[PDB]
Design a protein around this ligand. Structure first.
Ligand SMILES: *[C@@H]1O[C@H](CO)[C@@H](O[C@@H]2O[C@H](CO)[C@@H](O)[C@H](O)[C@H]2NC(C)=O)[C@H](O)[C@H]1NC(C)=O
Ligand SMILES: *[C@@H]1O[C@H](CO)[C@@H](O[C@@H]2O[C@H](CO)[C@@H](O)[C@H](O)[C@H]2NC(C)=O)[C@H](O)[C@H]1NC(C)=O
Ligand SMILES: *[C@@H]1O[C@H](CO)[C@@H](O[C@@H]2O[C@H](CO)[C@@H](O)[C@H](O)[C@H]2NC(C)=O)[C@H](O)[C@H]1NC(C)=O
Ligand SMILES: *[C@@H]1O[C@H](CO)[C@@H](O[C@@H]2O[C@H](CO)[C@@H](O)[C@H](O)[C@H]2NC(C)=O)[C@H](O)[C@H]1NC(C)=O
Ligand SMILES: *[C@@H]1O[C@H](CO)[C@@H](O)[C@H](O)[C@H]1NC(C)=O
Ligand SMILES: *[C@@H]1O[C@H](CO)[C@@H](O)[C@H](O)[C@H]1NC(C)=O
Ligand SMILES: *[C@@H]1O[C@H](CO)[C@@H](O)[C@H](O)[C@H]1NC(C)=O
Ligand SMILES: *[C@@H]1O[C@H](CO)[C@@H](O)[C@H](O)[C@H]1NC(C)=O
Ligand SMILES: *[C@@H]1O[C@H](CO)[C@@H](O)[C@H](O)[C@H]1NC(C)=O
Ligand SMILES: *[C@@H]1O[C@H](CO)[C@@H](O)[C@H](O)[C@H]1NC(C)=O
Ligand SMILES: *[C@@H]1O[C@H](CO)[C@@H](O)[C@H](O)[C@H]1NC(C)=O
Length: 1178
């Protein structure tokens, strides 16, 4: 019985925590019972170890799954092989294997902060939510790390435990923190996940602008219309002015723009006629998009808010758009498509235009004979209509062209399925919206009589369903693992053994089995009124996280909450990319979502309430329900006149994660209130005009007396009638449903936060508000920072005492002085995750071989000296060194010189041979380097030395940035001396004394250039010359120092070169404590771009960073730092061990003139203490 026997489909990817499910189908020509064993093998260091395995017995004519056990989540990117072996009772039947791609995303995490914009002296409250792939809660140990934009580790929590996946943590910011995008990192299992939140100086806006405009606009349209809605947070309309800039984005023309300035009361309509886009199509061939910018200024405060939208311009009045069409042509089957014909402005299509028929031209070409057919179709009321036309059997390319009233659309389908029997099937879906649990219908059509169909459903690179359907139409029920995109592959085998298949990719909308509903007790409430928030969940023993914030937090255009969009983005992150194969007849159709097939089937009169409490985050609740499905939490409404927006999430062990469908709003509003137009920061002594806006929303115009309370922290400039208080009260008239503004000149006289109490009294109502102004100090801000390294790596000494002093300038503004002291146990280095991307194959020419070779050596030396090198990366690294060493040894000539092309170039380069000697000398503890090659390079470099010691280059260097290091011969001598000066390991008799005398003479005449000076300093520090100290001192004199920063800026990569060379000069002269600002400059010049830029400064920078780590390579740290002195009445103690070695611990000291501290370190290791002084001058 010849024919097909088996068909085994296994996915080509593997993720940790996901079961590798394969599908086995046994056919008519196979025996009764076939035992299928699937093995997973890990290939490390040319050892293949069977990690996971499973076995099963399958019967003839049955389609079942063989499921492997789950991979552990601790695994990494190793070589994985899947081997499938199907056996009979006395003989094997198939035995094959493949490679598997690895995906690093194993679990889901959500970092929810209460807001994304934070003021200084605030508190960040956040939750870490750890879930599985099927959104069940995950219990694990993890680390939380909060860092500044300068990437110093400021806060950390080590080995926290998650109670049902939710971790609630808080973090108090400093008084003056580093402004910018702070980062929260979670190191769960072996993966780091990031979440950025901004810390800046901002004032919360009290209203929002929405701009309702059509997305498209026709050129033949007479008017472009739109609506502007400026609305307060508490729901009242905004009375103000609008400036409207209609600006074409044509870069060919000028900045011509229509401007329209008018008035707005809540909502306002605008329209532009053709005399307002007459400058627009003058400026624009095809027209580009235009920008409509709205600036609304509130007429009582002057606070302006601007929004912008983009409008695309279409040349025709109607747009004809297509969907629901197969991307692969199927011969002898009906092509179906759905057409939306809509107007440009988005309005409904009129009954007059419905009489015009859409002319659709089909063009089937055998790519060269073509068949062209024009069909007329009617248009419905909604404008969405389906077309269906047959396809001829020889058609290879289909061209569709639709015309309607001059509007044209066209596309072409070129992908043709080829079959020897010319038998094809088509799988189509009828439901536009597919959800989880709702069954959806599938229709299978074919040009011939169909056999028993077999369907396989694959989602997230995992085969999640199998089965056999005999009917040509069947219903399938999606599950939670099908999200977001599912492959339904429907196939059957003909009598000659040919597989006939179709693959349908469908988006599956995720529904949640767990539901959480939030209800306020009231829709509208007053401030300081007790309301109740009711939480209703689906299941008991659930943990509920509730956030309820100000609406202006949502109006800050930044949010870090857990919503449906983040869940959809994480589900799209679960989806992966796929690769290609050899495409026998349908294996591309199989591999459309990553499937690898094994088969043989192809062969042959009261005081007002004083409003003081103004928070931005009202409710930050983290509770456990226990036995309750609903709970009522009683809260007090704060004093902010706004709307409070509440959302939340629920986590249960049975159902998983659940989210609120809509945010629920509570309106905190009173009809008579006070608004203070305040900036964030005022300087002390400056007279600023406080703007008090009395908002009256009653039905009558009221005479309001505004009374500001006296304080000793500020002065009111204008006087009052009485002598008890100056500027005590003012009188004004506020209209009904409007606001009025009164100015008060205020001169603050004290630093810090100052309270202002404003009381508005009317015969109808009253209000009182107490608000904080942050008053800073006048003058110009200056910063000083001094760093001291305390070294305890030697076990002879145990206590080290150092002194740090600073004297203030005499023109310092009093009260502006701030003294901080930070202690760290280790420096911030390059991150290992990006540096693993910096290791590569040595390829190309010899200079390209060095470009792909040398940073691998210096990165391997750096993580060898930092003790963070994994074994697989190590074996890959030394494999790269061996192959790069062989590729560089291909380019060695007969005289020992090296070049880019080897023997093809006429003369070799001295600089490239020096680079060869330096890289091969560094690589010699790691790989085996032949000493005759190194001796030949010594003799060829020594043969190019003159009598004075000056060296000369007869060769050529192709690359610019390799030759960009200063072609003057003094740099050549210094580079060849610092490359030849590592050669003392083998023999120590190197006579470069004439060259050292030449470099000392070149230093003695006086150097203007700067890289050259750093190279002379490194050479003289390496030989231990007496002129090295003067050169390093004058190079430190040439350095720019600011903010604990020492660097060199060239007036014309080279800055990193001079910083690393002077750093190695400081290390070789035992001035380790002075290299710390340069080391911080090296730490800061690599944060935004991963590793180090280019290669030539990358090598020297990682050499200096590994040379620091080799000097302080003690893995045990137990350092106690005690800070005493006149500036500290209590001794400040920092404890540094191996866990908090990266923690930048900080402490604040009193202001004593002059500021002097004594820092005593006791223990073992090394520590760095930095004294920072911030002062304002006049
Ligand atoms: C866009 O706004 C303009 C505002 O002028 C509208 O033009 C007016 O339309 C009404 C109703 O047809 C006429 O009675 C007026 O005489 C028109 N005013 C003019 C031309 O200045 C226009 O209809 C609006 N278009 C849309 C699509 O809403
Ligand atoms: C719209 O165009 C006008 C010019 O027709 C711009 O007005 C000038 O703008 C510049 C830059 O702000 C000012 O320096 C001039 O004093 C303005 N003069 C006039 C005559 O208005 C206007 O700024 C444009 N609007 C936008 C937002 O692009
Ligand atoms: C070598 O680097 C130093 C920086 O340390 C350069 O000196 C700076 O020159 C600029 C531009 O005129 C000044 O604004 C700085 O004040 C200087 N800083 C210091 C620390 O002196 C110097 O110019 C560089 N040399 C060359 C040849 O580029
Ligand atoms: C801080 O360090 C200084 C310098 O070590 C200490 O200086 C003292 O100076 C007086 C001068 O008469 C000597 O008599 C002391 O013996 C010194 N003490 C030493 C050397 O430790 C100073 O006392 C230290 N104390 C504080 C808290 O500032
Ligand atoms: C893997 O199989 C086990 C065994 O039943 C099951 O509990 C687990 O949920 C499966 N995991 C996935 C991701 O399907
Ligand atoms: C299994 O491996 C062999 C050896 O390369 C190969 O010839 C064959 O095509 C593979 N597949 C099957 C189904 O035997
Ligand atoms: C703006 O146009 C809409 C659409 O007809 C209309 O309902 C609304 O009243 C208009 N607003 C103003 C202020 O004219
Ligand atoms: C609004 O205007 C200010 C001041 O020019 C500008 O800083 C801000 O970016 C603008 N915002 C928008 C959304 O255009
Ligand atoms: C294609 O559509 C026409 C018109 O409804 C119908 O007669 C024909 O049977 C269809 N063919 C297939 C294969 O569905
Ligand atoms: C479509 O309408 C045009 C114009 O009336 C006519 O010339 C053409 O023959 C029509 N085509 C069909 C298929 O009815
Ligand atoms: C599938 O349906 C056909 C048509 O009725 C029938 O002949 C065949 O036996 C069915 N196969 C199975 C396995 O039910």
């Amino acid at each position: 019985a010849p024919g097909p026997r088996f068909l085994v489909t296994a996915p080509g990817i593997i993720r940790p925590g996901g079961n590798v499910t394969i599908g086995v189908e046994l056919l008519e020509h196979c025996p009764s019972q076939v035992t299928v064993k699937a093995e997973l093998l890990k290939t490390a260091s040319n050892l293949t170890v069977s990690v996971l395995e499973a076995e099963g017995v399958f019967e003839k004519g049955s389609f079942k799954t063989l499921t492997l056990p789950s991979l552990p989540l601790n695994s990494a990117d190793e070589i994985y092989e899947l081997r499938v072996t199907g056996r009979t009772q006395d003989e094997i039947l198939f035995s094959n294997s493949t490679r598997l791609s690895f995906e690093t995303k194993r679990i889901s995490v959500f970092i929810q902060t209460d807001k994304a914009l934070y003021k200084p002296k605030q508190e960040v409250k956040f939750r870490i939510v750890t879930l599985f792939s099927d959104f069940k809660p995950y219990k694990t140990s993890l680390n939380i790390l909060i860092k500044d934009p300068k990437s110093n580790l400021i806060q950390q929590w080590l080995s926290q435990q998650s109670d049902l996946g939710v971790i609630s943590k808080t973090f108090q910011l400093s008084s003056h923190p580093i402004l910018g995008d702070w980062s929260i990192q979670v190191q769960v299992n072996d993966q780091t996940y990031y979440q950025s939140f901004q810390v800046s100086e901002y004032v919360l806006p009290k209203f929002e602008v929405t701009l309702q405009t059509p997305l498209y606009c026709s050129m033949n349209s007479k008017h472009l219309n739109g609506t502007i809605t400026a609305k307060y947070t508490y729901g009242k309309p905004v009375k103000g002015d609008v400036t409207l800039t209609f600006l074409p984005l044509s870069f060919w023309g000028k900045k011509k723009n229509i401007t329209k300035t008018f008035k707005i009361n809540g909502s306002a309509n605008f329209s532009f006629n053709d005399e307002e886009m007459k400058n627009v199509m003058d400026s624009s061939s095809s027209p580009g998009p235009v920008e409509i910018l709205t600036t609304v200024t509130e007429s009582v405060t002057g606070i302006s808010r601007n929004v912008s939208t983009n409008v695309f311009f279409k040349q025709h009045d109607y747009i004809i758009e297509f969907f629901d069409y197969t991307t692969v042509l199927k011969p002898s089957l009906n092509f179906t498509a759905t057409v939306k014909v809509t107007r440009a402005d988005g309005n409904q299509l009129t009954l007059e235009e419905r009489r015009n028929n859409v002319v659709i031209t089909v063009t089937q070409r055998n790519y060269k004979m073509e068949a062209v057919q024009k069909i007329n179709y009617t248009v419905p009321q909604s404008g969405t209509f389906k077309i269906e036309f047959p396809i001829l059997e020889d058609s290879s390319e289909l061209q569709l062209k639709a015309y309607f009233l001059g509007s044209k659309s066209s596309m072409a389908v070129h992908s043709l399925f080829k079959s020897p029997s010319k038998t094809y099937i088509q799988l189509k879906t009828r439901d536009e919206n597919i959800k989880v649990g709702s069954p959806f219908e599938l229709v299978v059509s074919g040009n011939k009589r169909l056999k028993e169909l077999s369907y396989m459903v694959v989602s997230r690179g995992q085969l999640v369903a199998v089965g056999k359907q005999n009917s040509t139409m069947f219903s399938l029920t999606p599950e939670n693992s099908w999200t977001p995109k599912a492959c339904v592959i429907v196939y059957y085998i003909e009598d000659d053994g040919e597989i006939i298949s179709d693959v349908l990719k469908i988006p599956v909308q995720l529904v949640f089995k767990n539901k959480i509903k939030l209800y306020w007790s009231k829709v509208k409430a007053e401030p300081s009124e007790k309301v109740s928030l009711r939480i209703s969940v689906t299941q008991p023993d659930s943990i509920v996280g509730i956030v309820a914030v100000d609406k202006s937090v949502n109006l800050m255009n930044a949010s870090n909450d857990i919503t449906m969009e983040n869940v959809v983005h994480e589900l799209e992150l679960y989806n992966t990319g796929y690769y290609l194969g050899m495409f026998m007849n349908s294996f591309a159709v199989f591999q459309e979502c990553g499937l690898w097939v094994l088969t043989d089937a192809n062969l042959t009169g009261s005081s007002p309430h004083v409003r003081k409490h103004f928070p931005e985050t009202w409710i930050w609740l983290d509770t456990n329900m226990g036995y309750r499905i609903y709970q009522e939490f009683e809260v007090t409404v704060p004093d902010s006149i706004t709307s409070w927006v509440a959302t939340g999430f629920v986590i249960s062990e049975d159902l998983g994660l659940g989210l609120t469908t809509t945010p629920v709003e509570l309106q905190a509003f009173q009809p008579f209130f006070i608004f203070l137009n305040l900036p964030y920061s005022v300087i002390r002594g400056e007279e600023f005009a406080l703007e008090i806006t009395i908002f009256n929303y009653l039905k009558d115009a009221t005479e309001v007396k505004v009374i500001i309370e006296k304080s000793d922290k500020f002065d009111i400039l204008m006087t009052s009638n009485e002598i008890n208080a100056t500027g005590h009260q003012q009188t004004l008239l506020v209209p009904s449903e409007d606001g009025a503004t009164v100015l008060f000149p205020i001169r603050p006289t004290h630093l810090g936060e100052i309270p202002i109490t404003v009381t508005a009294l009317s015969p109808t109502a009253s209000d009182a508000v107490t608000q904080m102004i942050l008053v800073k100090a006048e003058g110009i801000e200056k910063s000083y920072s001094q760093s001291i390294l305390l070294d305890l790596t030697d076990n002879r000494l145990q206590s080290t005492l150092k002194t740090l002093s600073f004297s203030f300038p005499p023109n310092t503004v009093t009260g502006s002085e701030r003294v901080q002291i930070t202690a760290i146990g280790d420096v911030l280095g390059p991150s290992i995750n990006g540096l693993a991307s910096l290791i590569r194959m040595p390829y190309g020419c010899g200079e390209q071989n060095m470009i792909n070779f040398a940073p691998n050596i210096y990165i391997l030396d750096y993580l060898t000296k930092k003790k963070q090198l994994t074994d697989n990366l190590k074996e890959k690294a030394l494999s790269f060194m061996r192959q790069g060493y062989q590729r560089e040894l291909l380019y060695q000539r007969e005289d020992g010189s090296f070049s880019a092309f080897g023997n093809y170039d006429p003369s070799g380069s001295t600089w490239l041979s020096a680079f060869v000697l330096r890289c091969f000398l560094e690589a010699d503890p790691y790989i085996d380097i032949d000493q005759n090659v190194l001796h030949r390079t010594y003799t060829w470099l020594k043969g190019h030395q003159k009598s004075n010691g000056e060296f000369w280059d007869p060769g050529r260097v192709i690359h610019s940035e390799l030759q960009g290091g200063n072609k003057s011969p003094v740099t050549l001598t210094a580079y060849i001396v610092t490359s030849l000066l590592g050669y003392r390991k083998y023999q120590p008799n190197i006579d470069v004394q004439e060259s050292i005398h030449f470099l000392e003479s070149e230093f003695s005449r006086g150097i203007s250039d700067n890289y050259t000076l750093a190279l002379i300093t490194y050479a003289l520090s390496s030989v231990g010359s007496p002129k090295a100290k003067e050169a390093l001192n004058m190079l430190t004199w040439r350095a720019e120092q600011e903010g604990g920063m020492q660097f060199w800026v060239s007036s014309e990569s080279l800055d990193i070169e001079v910083a690393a060379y002077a750093l190695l000069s400081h290390f070789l002269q035992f001035q380790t404590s002075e290299g710390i600002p340069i080391m911080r400059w090296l730490s800061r010049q690599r944060n935004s771009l991963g590793g180090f830029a280019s290669t030539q400064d990358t090598t020297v920078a990682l050499k200096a960073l590994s040379e620091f780590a080799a000097l302080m390579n003690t893995e045990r740290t137990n350092i106690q730092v005690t800070v005493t002195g006149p500036s500290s009445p209590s001794p400040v103690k920092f404890l540094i061990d191996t866990h908090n070695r990266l923690l930048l611990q900080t402490a604040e000291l009193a202001v004593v003139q002059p500021t002097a501290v004594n820092i005593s370190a006791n223990g073992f290791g090394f520590a760095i203490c930095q004294l920072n002084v911030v002062y304002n001058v006049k």
